[PDB]
Design an enzyme around this catalytic site. Sequence first.
Site, PDB file in Angstrom:
ATOM      1  N   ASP A  55      -9.619   4.690   1.429  1.00  0.00           N
ATOM      2  CA  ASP A  55     -10.136   3.470   2.032  1.00  0.00           C
ATOM      3  C   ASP A  55     -11.639   3.581   2.239  1.00  0.00           C
ATOM      4  O   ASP A  55     -12.141   4.599   2.721  1.00  0.00           O
ATOM      5  CB  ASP A  55      -9.436   3.203   3.363  1.00  0.00           C
ATOM      6  CG  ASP A  55      -7.964   2.900   3.194  1.00  0.00           C
ATOM      7  OD1 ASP A  55      -7.461   3.017   2.058  1.00  0.00           O
ATOM      8  OD2 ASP A  55      -7.307   2.543   4.194  1.00  0.00           O
ATOM      9  N   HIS A 111      -9.312  -0.217  -1.463  1.00  0.00           N
ATOM     10  CA  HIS A 111      -8.511   0.993  -1.570  1.00  0.00           C
ATOM     11  C   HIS A 111      -7.602   0.873  -2.784  1.00  0.00           C
ATOM     12  O   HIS A 111      -7.391  -0.217  -3.320  1.00  0.00           O
ATOM     13  CB  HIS A 111      -7.688   1.243  -0.299  1.00  0.00           C
ATOM     14  CG  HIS A 111      -6.656   0.193  -0.025  1.00  0.00           C
ATOM     15  ND1 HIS A 111      -5.582  -0.035  -0.859  1.00  0.00           N
ATOM     16  CD2 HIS A 111      -6.526  -0.682   0.999  1.00  0.00           C
ATOM     17  CE1 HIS A 111      -4.841  -1.010  -0.364  1.00  0.00           C
ATOM     18  NE2 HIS A 111      -5.392  -1.420   0.763  1.00  0.00           N
ATOM     19  N   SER A 146      -8.198  -4.761   0.439  1.00  0.00           N
ATOM     20  CA  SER A 146      -8.095  -4.456  -0.983  1.00  0.00           C
ATOM     21  C   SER A 146      -7.802  -5.706  -1.803  1.00  0.00           C
ATOM     22  O   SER A 146      -8.599  -6.104  -2.659  1.00  0.00           O
ATOM     23  CB  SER A 146      -7.007  -3.405  -1.204  1.00  0.00           C
ATOM     24  OG  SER A 146      -5.779  -3.828  -0.637  1.00  0.00           O
ATOM     25  N   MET A 147      -6.654  -6.339  -1.561  1.00  0.00           N
ATOM     26  CA  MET A 147      -6.318  -7.539  -2.316  1.00  0.00           C
ATOM     27  C   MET A 147      -7.325  -8.648  -2.046  1.00  0.00           C
ATOM     28  O   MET A 147      -7.763  -9.339  -2.973  1.00  0.00           O
ATOM     29  CB  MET A 147      -4.905  -8.003  -1.973  1.00  0.00           C
ATOM     30  CG  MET A 147      -4.300  -8.943  -3.000  1.00  0.00           C
ATOM     31  SD  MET A 147      -3.976  -8.134  -4.578  1.00  0.00           S
ATOM     32  CE  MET A 147      -5.336  -8.735  -5.572  1.00  0.00           C
ATOM     33  N   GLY A 157      -2.175  -7.618   0.695  1.00  0.00           N
ATOM     34  CA  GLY A 157      -0.832  -8.091   0.417  1.00  0.00           C
ATOM     35  C   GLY A 157      -0.320  -7.556  -0.905  1.00  0.00           C
ATOM     36  O   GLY A 157      -0.858  -6.594  -1.453  1.00  0.00           O
TER      37      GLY A 157
END
Lengths: 106, 192, 192, 192, 192, 192, 192, 192
Positions: H170, H121, H96-97, H67
Site C-alpha cells: 500500500d 496497492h 486502489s480501484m 472494491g
Amino acid sequence: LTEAGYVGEDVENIIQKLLQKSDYDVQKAQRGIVYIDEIDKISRKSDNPSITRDVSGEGVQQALLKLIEGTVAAVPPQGQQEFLQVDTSKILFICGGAFAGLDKVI
Amino acid sequence: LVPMVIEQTSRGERSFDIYSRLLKERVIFLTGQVEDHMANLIVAQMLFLEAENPEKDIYLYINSPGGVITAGMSIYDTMQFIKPDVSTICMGQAASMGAFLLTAGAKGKRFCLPNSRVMIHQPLGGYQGQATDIEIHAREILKVKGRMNELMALHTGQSLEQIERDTERDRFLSAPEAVEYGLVDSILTHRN
Amino acid sequence: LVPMVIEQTSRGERSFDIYSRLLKERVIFLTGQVEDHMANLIVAQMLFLEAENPEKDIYLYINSPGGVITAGMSIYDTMQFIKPDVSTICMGQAASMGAFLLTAGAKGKRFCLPNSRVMIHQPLGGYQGQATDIEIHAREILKVKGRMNELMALHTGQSLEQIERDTERDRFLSAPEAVEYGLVDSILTHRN
Amino acid sequence: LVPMVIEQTSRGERSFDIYSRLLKERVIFLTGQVEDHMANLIVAQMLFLEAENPEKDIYLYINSPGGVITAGMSIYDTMQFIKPDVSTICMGQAASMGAFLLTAGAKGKRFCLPNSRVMIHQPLGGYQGQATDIEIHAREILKVKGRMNELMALHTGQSLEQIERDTERDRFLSAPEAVEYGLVDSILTHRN
Amino acid sequence: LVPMVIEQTSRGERSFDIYSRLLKERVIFLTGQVEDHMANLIVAQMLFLEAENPEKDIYLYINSPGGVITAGMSIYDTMQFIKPDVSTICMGQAASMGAFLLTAGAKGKRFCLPNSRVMIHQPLGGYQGQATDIEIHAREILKVKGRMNELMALHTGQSLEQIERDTERDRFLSAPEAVEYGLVDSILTHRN
Amino acid sequence: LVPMVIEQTSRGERSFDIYSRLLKERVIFLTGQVEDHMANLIVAQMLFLEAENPEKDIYLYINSPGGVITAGMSIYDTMQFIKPDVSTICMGQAASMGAFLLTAGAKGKRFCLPNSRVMIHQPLGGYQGQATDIEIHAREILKVKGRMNELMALHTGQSLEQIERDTERDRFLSAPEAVEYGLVDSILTHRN
Amino acid sequence: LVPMVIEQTSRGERSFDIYSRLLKERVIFLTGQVEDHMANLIVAQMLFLEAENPEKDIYLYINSPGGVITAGMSIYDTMQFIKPDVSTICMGQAASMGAFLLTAGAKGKRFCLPNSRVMIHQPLGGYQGQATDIEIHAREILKVKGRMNELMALHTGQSLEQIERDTERDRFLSAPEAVEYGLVDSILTHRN
Amino acid sequence: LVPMVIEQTSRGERSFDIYSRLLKERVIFLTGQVEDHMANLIVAQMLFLEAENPEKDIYLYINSPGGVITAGMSIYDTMQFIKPDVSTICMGQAASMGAFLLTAGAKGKRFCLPNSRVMIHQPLGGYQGQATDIEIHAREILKVKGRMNELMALHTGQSLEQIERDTERDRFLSAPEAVEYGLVDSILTHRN
C-alpha cells in the site's frame, strides 16, 4: 364558437353567414339549413363538476339550446346599431362530429 | 410485487392494484395467519363495502392456517353485524380460525373449491406464572372453547356434543366432506 | 398492503386508502401494542376531526392487547379534552389499556361486539438499581395504579374498592359481563 | 427494482411495470417457492383476466422449485374453474408443485422449453406430538398423496399405479421425456 | 401507516399528511427517543414556521421519554432564538429532556394534560479509557449537569440549589405538581 | 438509488429510470447472482421487447459471477425462442452461467470488452439423503453437465471432447482468448 | 417521517419536504456520522447552490458527532473551492470532524448556539497486519494529523504548537469558549 | 434522505433529485465500495450521456475505498469505449480501484482536491480448495495484477517496473504527490 361576452366567436355569427347566402333576406334566412361541424370538441373535457366555466365547451352548448329549438337571435347588421332579428324556429341545424372515444362509453 | 390493472370507465382510465380492483367488486382476501392488523383491514373493507351497497353480497376468500382467536372474532362479529350477506369461499385450506370464518358465512353462500382441506380444532393457548393466574387464564380459554363450539354448531347445524367430540383433536375435512358436515353449502367446480 | 378505495363526490373522484377513507367519517382505528408513536398518531386524528366539526361523534375502534400507560393516558386526555364525544367500540379484545380507553368513551356511547374479550389488570412495571431508586419507582407505579383505578371507577360507576379487588388479578369479562360491570353501555349484534 | 414501460394508445401515454404490462397480454409469472401470498396473487390475476375476456387463453409461465400443497391447489382449482384455457409454459424448472400446475393446463396448450427439468415427487410433510395426532396428520398427508396422484394421472393420461410408482421417489424429466410421459404435449423451440 | 387528509382551499383540494396538515397550524410533534436526526427535523420545522409568520406562536407536543442532551439542546436553543413564542404541551410523559424542553417554552404558554407525567433527573453518561480521558469526560458531563440545572432553575423560577437537590435522583411530578414546581403554567383539562 | 432521466420528445416531456430508459432502447442488464427472481425479470423484458418490435435486435449486458443453472437456462431458452437476435456483451466478468449466456447470443453479435474475465466450469451441486436418492440427483446433475457441454460446443464451435476437458476445472479466459475459443465474436475497444 | 410543506410561489403552488424547502433557501443540514454517502450528498447540494447564485452566502448546520476524515475532507475542499461563502452554524454537538468543518466557514460567518458543545481531538485510526504495513499506515495517519492541525491553525488563528498540544486529547469547548479559541466568530442568542 | 430540487426550463418547472439534477450536467458520482450493481449503474449513466451528447465531456467524481476488480473494469472499459472524454475528480479519497479509475480519465482532464488522498496497492484475493484449482486462481490473480500494472503505467506514464515496485505494498499519495506520479493532471483549489 364560444360563450357570449368573450373574445371567441359567438353562436349568433352562424346566422350571419346564412344571411350572405340568402342575399341578406330575413324571410329566406328563416327557412334555411345549417351544418355545425366539430360538435364533438365542445363536449365537457372531463370537467363534469364544472370547476371552471367551459366557455369553449359547455358554454357553447348552453347558448345553442335556444338556437336549435328556435329563438329570435340578434345578428349584427353586417359582417350593433340595428341588431337584425332573425327567427331560428324553422331553421334546421345539422351537427357533425367524430366523437373520439364514444365507442368505449357505448 | 402486486401488479397494477387498468379499469375502463366512461370518464376515463384509472389505475388500481390487483387487490384494490377486486375490492370494487365486493371481494375480500383473507390470506396468511390471522392477526389484529390484518383483521382490521378485513373489517374496514367489509364496513366500506356495506356503505357502498348494503344490499349486494360480499365475497370473502379464505386461505390461511388459522390465527389469533380474538382477531378472528372481530371479523365474525363484523360479518354478522353488517346487513349484506358475506359469501365465504375456501381456497387451498382453512384451519381452525379459517374454518370458523368459512362456516360463518350466509346460509347457502358458503363454497369451497374441489381440492381444498378444512381443519377444525379446539383453541390453543398457554400461560406461565402463579397458580392463581393459571386458573384465571385456564378458565378463560375454556370459555372460548365452549363459545366457539356453540357458534360452530349453530352455523354447521350439528349438535354441540358432536362438535366437541369432533373438535377435541385436529380433524381434516375435504370439500365433499365439509358439505356433509355443514361447514360449507356447495362446491364450485366449473363456471356454468 | 392497505387497499385503495374510490370516493365519488360532486367535486370529483378522489382515491384514498381504506384507513383514510374511514377517517373522513370520523373513524379512528386503535390496533396493536399501545406505544407513543401509534398513540401520538391517534391524538393527531382526534384533534384534526375536532377542528373539522366538533359536533359529530368520533368513533374509536379498540382491538389491542394493551401497552405502555403513558401512551394510553395521552389518548384518554385527548378524548376528554375535545368537546365532541368519542364513541368507543370494542372488537376482538381490549386489555388493560384497551379496556381503560374503551370505558373512557362518552357515557351511553360505549359499545362492544357480542364476541369480545375485555381484560382489566393492574399496571405492570419494574426497575433495577439502588434501593433508593427502587423506592422512587415503586411509589410512582403505585400512584399510577391508584390513579387509573379512580378513573376506571368513575366511568364504570363501581366503587373504588371493588375496582381495586377486581383489578388485583387479571380479569376477563365477556360482552354481556362488561355491560353490567359498567365498562360498556350496550352490545351491537346486528344493524338496526 | 423493476423497469417501467410506456404503452401508446389513443388515450395517451400510459406507464406500466414489466409484469403489469405483460398482464394485459394475459401472461402470468409463477416464480419462487409456492406459498399462500404468491398463490393468492396468481388467483386474483386469473380471475381478473377471466372478466376482461373469458374466451382468450392465459399464459402461465412456471419456474419454481415447488412449495406448499394447499397454496398450489388454490391455483389448480382456479385454473380449472375459470372458463378460459390456461396455457402453462415450463421454463427453467418445475418441481412437484410446479410440475402439477404445469400438467394442469388445457390439453394441447401445456408447453415446455427445450432446456428445462421437471421433477415429480410425493408430498413432503411432518408432525411432532402425541401418537394420536401423528396418525391423524400421517393419514391426512396420505390422502393428499393419493388425491395428488389421481389428478396427475388424469392430466398426464398415465395409469394411477404408474404415477404412484414413478412419484414414490424423486424423478427428473427433460423437455422431450415430459412429452412422452404426458406432463406436456409440445416443445417451444422457436417462435413460428 | 400515516393517514392522509384533504384540506379545503379556495384554489382547490390539497392532500396533506396527518402530521404535515398539523404543521400548517404551527403544531410540531416531539415523540420518541430524542436523537440528532429527529432534533434537526424539529429545528427545521421551527425555522420554517418562523418565516411563515414570526408573530404567531408555535405549539410543540412533548411525549418523548428523553434522549441525547446535545440533540435536545439544539431544540432548546432554536426555541429561544426564534422570536415566536413556543408553547409546549405535555402528553403522556416528559422525561429529563422532555421535561427540560417542556419547561423551556414561553412563560405562560406551558401546559400539561391532567394525566401527564413529568420526570427530571441529572445527566446520564459514561466513558471507558485512560484516567486522563475519564477526568476530561467526567468534567464535561459535570458542566452539562450544572448548565442544565441553571437553565431549569431560570424557567422553573426555583433556586439553583433546590433544583440540584431535586435532580439528584429521578423525581416524578404529576400535572398538578408540575404547576406548583414551575415546570408548567396550567393544566388543559377541557376545551373550555 | 437509481437516478432519473428525462426524455425530450416533440409530443411532450417524460421521465424514466436509468435502467428503464435503456430498456426502451432494447437493452437489458444482467447483474448479480443468477436466480429465478432476477431471471424472470430478464425473461419478461425479452418478451416485452419482442412484442414491441420482433424485427429489432436485443442487447443484453452480462456482468455476474454466475448462479443457479435452472434460472440461467430459463434465459437461454428465451433467447432462442424469440426470433429477434439477442446480442450479448460481456462487461467486467462472465462466470459459468454468465459465460454460457454470453456465448448463447446470436452469431456475430457476441461482444466482449478488452478488459473482461470469462470463466467456464462444470455445474456445481449437492444432495444429502439416502443412497438411492443420491443416485437420482447424481445422474441428473451429470445429464445437466453433458447437456450444457453440448450447447457450449454448438455455440463456440469447439468439439465435445475439447469442451469437456476445458470445463473439467475452472478456466479463466481473457477477452482476446474468448475470441479464439469461440465464446465471443469480436472485442469492442472503441466507438468508430 | 419528514413532513411536507407547500410554498406559495409565483405561477403555482408546490409541495416540498421540510429539508428540500430549506435547501431552496441555501440551507444544508449536516447531521449524524460523517460518511462517504452523506458527504457526497452534501457536496452535491453545495455545488447545486453555487449554480443558482454563485454570490449568495450558503449555510451549513453542523450537528454531527464526527466521522470519517476522508468523507469530511471532501466537504471541506468543496467549501473552500466554491466561490460562495459557507456559513457554519453549530447546533448541539460538533466533534473533531464536525468541529473541523465548523471552522472551515468564511471568516466572520461562523456561528454557534449558546448551549452547544465543540470537541476537537486528534485523528482516530487503526490497522492490523505485517510490521511493514503498520509503518505505512502509521505514517499516513500521522501525516493526516499534521495536515488537519495546520488547517485548524489557519482557520482558528491559534499557533500550530497550541493546536497540536490542545488536540492530543479530547478538548471540550463551550460556545463562549469556542469564540475565544477562534473556532467560531459569534454566538446567536436571539434575532436582532 | 435525498433532497429534491426544482429546475427552471422553457417547458416549465420540473422537480429533480440532487443526484438526478447533477446527472443532466454530465456529472456521475462514484461513491462507496465498487461492486457489480453500482458499477452497472455508472455504466448505464455513461452510455446515456454519450447518446444525449457524444461531444461533451463527462465528469466522474470518485470517492470510494476500492472494491471488486471486475466491477471496476466494467467502468474502465466503458470510459475508454465511449467517444466523450471522461473527467475524473477525486473527492475525499481514492483507493486502489478508485485510484485506477481516477487515472483512467482523459489525459489533461484528471483533477484532485487539495486534501484528497490517493492509495494504490496490488490486487487482493483468495481461494480455498485443492492444489490444482488453487493454482488456477493463484495464476489468474497474477494476470490481473500484471494487466492492472500495465494499464496503470500507460495512464500514469511511469515505467512498468516502477509501478510494480510501488504497487507491491500500500502506498498513499497526497494531492500534490499524485501530480508528480502522474495519477492526476492538476489540483483544483478555487473557482476562477
